[PDB]
Amino acid sequence: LRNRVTDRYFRIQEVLKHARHFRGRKNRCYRLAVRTVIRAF
Amino acid sequence: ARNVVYPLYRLGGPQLRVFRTNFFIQLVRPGVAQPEDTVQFRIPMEMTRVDLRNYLEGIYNVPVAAVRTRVQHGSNKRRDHRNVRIKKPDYKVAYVQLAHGQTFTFPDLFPEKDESPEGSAADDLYSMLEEERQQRQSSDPRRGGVPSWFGL
Amino acid sequence: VKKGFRAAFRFQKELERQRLLRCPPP
Amino acid sequence: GADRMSKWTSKRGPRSFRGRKGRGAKGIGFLTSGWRFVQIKEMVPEFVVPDLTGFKLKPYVSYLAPESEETPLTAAQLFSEAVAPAIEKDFKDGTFDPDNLEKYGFEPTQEGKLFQLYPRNFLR
Amino acid sequence: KVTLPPHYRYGMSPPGSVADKRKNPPWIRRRPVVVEPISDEDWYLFCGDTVEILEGKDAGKQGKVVQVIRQRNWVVVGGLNTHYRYIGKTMDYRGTMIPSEAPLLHRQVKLVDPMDRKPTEIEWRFTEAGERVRVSTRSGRIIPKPEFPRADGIVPETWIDGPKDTSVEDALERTYVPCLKTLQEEVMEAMGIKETRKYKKVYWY
Amino acid sequence: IGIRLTLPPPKVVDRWNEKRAMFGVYDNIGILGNFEKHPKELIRGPIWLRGWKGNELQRCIRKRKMVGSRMFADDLHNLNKRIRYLYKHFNRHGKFR
Amino acid sequence: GLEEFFDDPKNWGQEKVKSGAAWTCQQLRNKSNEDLHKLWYVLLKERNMLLTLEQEAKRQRLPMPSPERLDKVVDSMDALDKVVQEREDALRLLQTGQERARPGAWRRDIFGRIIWHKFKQWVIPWHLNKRYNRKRFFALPYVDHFLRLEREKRARIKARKENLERKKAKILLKKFPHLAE
Amino acid sequence: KARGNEYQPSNIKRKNKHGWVRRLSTPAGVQVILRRMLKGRKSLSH
RNA sequence: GCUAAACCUAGCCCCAAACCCACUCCACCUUACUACCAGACAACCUUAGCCAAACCAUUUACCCAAAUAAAGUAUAGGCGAU
RNA sequence: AGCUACCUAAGAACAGCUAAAAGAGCACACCCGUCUAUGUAGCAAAAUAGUGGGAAGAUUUAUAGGUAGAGGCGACAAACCU
RNA sequence: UCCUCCGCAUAAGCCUGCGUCAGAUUAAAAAACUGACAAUUAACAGCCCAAUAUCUACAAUCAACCAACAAGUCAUUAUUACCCUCACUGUCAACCCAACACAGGCAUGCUCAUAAGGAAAGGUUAAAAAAAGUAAAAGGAACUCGGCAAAUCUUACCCCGC
Ligand SMILES: [K+]
Ligand SMILES: [Mg+2]
Ligand SMILES: [Mg+2]
Ligand SMILES: [Mg+2]
Ligand SMILES: [Mg+2]
Ligand SMILES: [Mg+2]
Ligand SMILES: [Mg+2]
Ligand SMILES: [Mg+2]
Ligand SMILES: [Mg+2]
Ligand SMILES: [Mg+2]
């Protein structure tokens, strides 16, 4: 049984939702946004 | 001949005879200017100039004075969609010179006049096509793109 | 193409919410 | 490197290669001293061409011809139409010798014939 | 001379046509169409048959099968199941609108009673003379097989032999006399060719 | 990207096809049948896996023993390498000794 | 003469030339060998004429008038071959009992394969032929493992084809569940 | 000096080194061909 | 709004069952795929090593013809690793 | 061993000037690569320009063949063997 | 107007790779691209010899005179056998080895100077720095590790290795 993640889109938006008001590439690129959202929280 | 085992010959042995030849040739129009008595053929690769001499005088009763041949390489340059080469086959060309002062000019096998049939054709589909376009005309500039159908 | 139904259904719901915000009905 | 996929032909290689390989034409003689080629008349195939004056069979056959069932010839059908008539006759006449089969067309051996059926020694 | 990929998709235009080359190039790889296996014996619809369209806008209508495409279980019913398309259309010319038929599946059309002129189901049965025919499963009236124009296109009624056609008398003549001789030996004798030189034995290996 | 834009074709399950409706029938063939047959005799599968279980090294050893003489050469060579590989892994590596 | 490589000058330029049917094999079995020796050459001259026209069509970038004419002559010449080969084949079986005109044998090759070796014609016996005796008609033991790997490859091909047929037949009874019956 | 041009083609050399007859000449060269036939190569040799 | 995105088939995997594969006319061991000459040339013969032993040097499992069990027992071994 | 090292068979090239015994000198073709600059993802995975060493010889070079990795080959640089 | 390495042939290699037509659009910018159709013709070249015995000391170098050593590429006879006569293949190109339409590699003949073969500048401006040159007052190695490079066209010596 090969299991692959199918709802990764929704996992990503959970971070990106809080990054939309940031500046630069850290408002859309998860790799960068996830670090700035953690710092913001 | 082709694709057949030739009986081996030993000295003091019978003549080699072919009753039903599978050699098939085509008379071709030359690509360059040739002498008047020269006729060009495309012949099988396994057909020699001695065969072609005895072939033309045997089957067609053409008196032959000289035969010359050359092997044309077919382009292997084309690629199909898999980037694999497509081979245009090689073929043998023969130059035949007629004997008793005879000459030859390759006939015109597609005369224009004959390709125009005087007899009329009454195909509904073809006629409908030409008829309908003629009835339709260009939009009148002064109507400014208003549909013309409405009689009003 | 990944197996399953739930994420596809859930994504359909999100595309439907966006259409409404894009074209709010009267 | 070299092309491995293309056909190997006499157009390829050096002078010694290109003249040694051919294109499949059968030979009609031999070379002697001086690279003198001797054409052997009997090795040149002679076309046996029939007389076609007043021949009534033409390239095509008219569409107004009755259909027939295909029956490939077999050794039996050939036997029962070219040999049986004479054997059967002589069997009733008590002249059938089961030893002298040459009378009816049997060839005990192919050696000595111009056209030997096996091994075939004639062109099509 | 036939070059059809393994999953070639049959369609309206015939294999090899200009439109078929345009729709199915050598590199095309579409998902296969799943077609119900109908054995060649159980196929009861032929060119010329009269069928009743059972599904579509022309459902309930009747018409003649103008084309059968076996590979899709299709039949084209002349003038029915139609939509509209333009033809001869260029840049300037709008074109000529024509009706164009869409194919139907063997399940969407039923054959019609030979006399009742009503949709009926057929079961292939043999006759007293053992001839496979289409016997109605509802009435028994045998629906005959029509005569569609020979695919070749030759109407034997209007056939007149040309200068390169053999006469029936000559074509049906029998000049063959069975003999224990090859065409080689007979022609040598017929043309009076004499060979005294005996063929010497060869080594075969 | 990465998420399908339409719903997949709906999946219909016949919970009462013959395979499901009769599943488990004869699993008590021994205790209800005077133990003439063991329930393991109902298992269909590879000859080397019927009524038997093991880790992957045991399965490979068991398959090699029982059908190894009948295996294709490429497959037998892979099995020999797999046994050797698992032999080193299970006997020499790991957190616990 | 050379006019026999072309059609009748009246047919030059016509979009169609009406043509009869191809000589059927059965129509030719009624005919003598001498009549088929003549008929062959009537077909040869037509084929050469049709081959000429086909090429000149390509040279002129025009369609060949009535192309099926060429397809008929080929079919008609194929029949005649078959009819003439049936007779010598049948005659060869009666007089010698041999099923093939050319001698041969089943041989192992240097690669371990069983192949039908067609004999060639020679003037010397085989034990004196240098080039012939260089060919190996046997295989050595190092070939054995390769025969097994080739057989196992063939079996893998056959196993996949059969398993795929059973898969696609199962998908048919899903799409058409009225097909089980 | 500049490298890269170590291939100096000759049909004689190519045929004598890697051709069909050279391969069949030794049991190791026959097994070269068997390997290439198993893999299904279009070119078994030069 | 572009570039894109999305797809469900092709086939494949593991089992089971069953012991597979030829010439198709012509060509092909010589420079394979090359119609057609005076030869003799002929096959067999212990794997090793990585690695483990925390080095390494004796030693270090490798289907060999019934699943299970006897048994990781008798036994072998720088009596160590195994 | 189509590069390169060495070898085998059978080829080829070497102008002019001086000197005239010639592994003599000057100097082209040709072979090499001293020094400088350029270039350093180049024109080039070693080049270009100039300047150089040799240039009838232990010369240079075309062709085919030979020696094979526990090895070859080597005017030993542990060189060269795609 | 300017360049000229060159160039033309053969060999080897390569294998249709700037012919025509029709397409698209031609090229590190704007046909050598696609598809069809053509095409290289043997005298040059390649492809060769019936047997058995036997014969074959005396270079080449303008081969003469001289003079050599490293001592060399060119030859038959005897007797048998031997009527039979022009097949087959190469023949194109703007080309090959260098991942390239690569300043490299590439044998022979002939011309070289050319009768043959080619174009250094897309347009402009005319800063730095950089590259390649030419010229340079007075001085003339004061430069520098060193006269390196340039210029000129020198002398004498030391070490090492003949
Ligand atoms: K160690
Ligand atoms: Mg390289
Ligand atoms: Mg000097
Ligand atoms: Mg040296
Ligand atoms: Mg040293
Ligand atoms: Mg050192
Ligand atoms: Mg100073
Ligand atoms: Mg200072
Ligand atoms: Mg200096
Ligand atoms: Mg000293």
PDB file of C-alpha atoms in Angstrom, chain C residues 1-16:
ATOM      1  CA  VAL C   1      -3.033  11.394  -9.578  1.00  0.00           C
ATOM      2  CA  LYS C   2      -3.206  10.533  -5.902  1.00  0.00           C
ATOM      3  CA  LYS C   3      -5.636   8.076  -4.368  1.00  0.00           C
ATOM      4  CA  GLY C   4      -8.438   9.305  -2.173  1.00  0.00           C
ATOM      5  CA  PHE C   5     -11.462  11.531  -2.057  1.00  0.00           C
ATOM      6  CA  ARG C   6     -11.304  13.736   1.021  1.00  0.00           C
ATOM      7  CA  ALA C   7      -8.736  16.301  -0.087  1.00  0.00           C
ATOM      8  CA  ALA C   8     -10.365  16.530  -3.525  1.00  0.00           C
ATOM      9  CA  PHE C   9     -13.760  17.153  -1.899  1.00  0.00           C
ATOM     10  CA  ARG C  10     -12.245  19.620   0.535  1.00  0.00           C
ATOM     11  CA  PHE C  11     -10.471  21.416  -2.306  1.00  0.00           C
ATOM     12  CA  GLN C  12     -13.755  21.565  -4.224  1.00  0.00           C
ATOM     13  CA  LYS C  13     -15.328  23.339  -1.259  1.00  0.00           C
ATOM     14  CA  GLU C  14     -12.532  25.912  -1.285  1.00  0.00           C
ATOM     15  CA  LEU C  15     -12.844  26.549  -5.017  1.00  0.00           C
ATOM     16  CA  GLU C  16     -16.572  27.050  -4.458  1.00  0.00           C
TER      17      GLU C  16
END
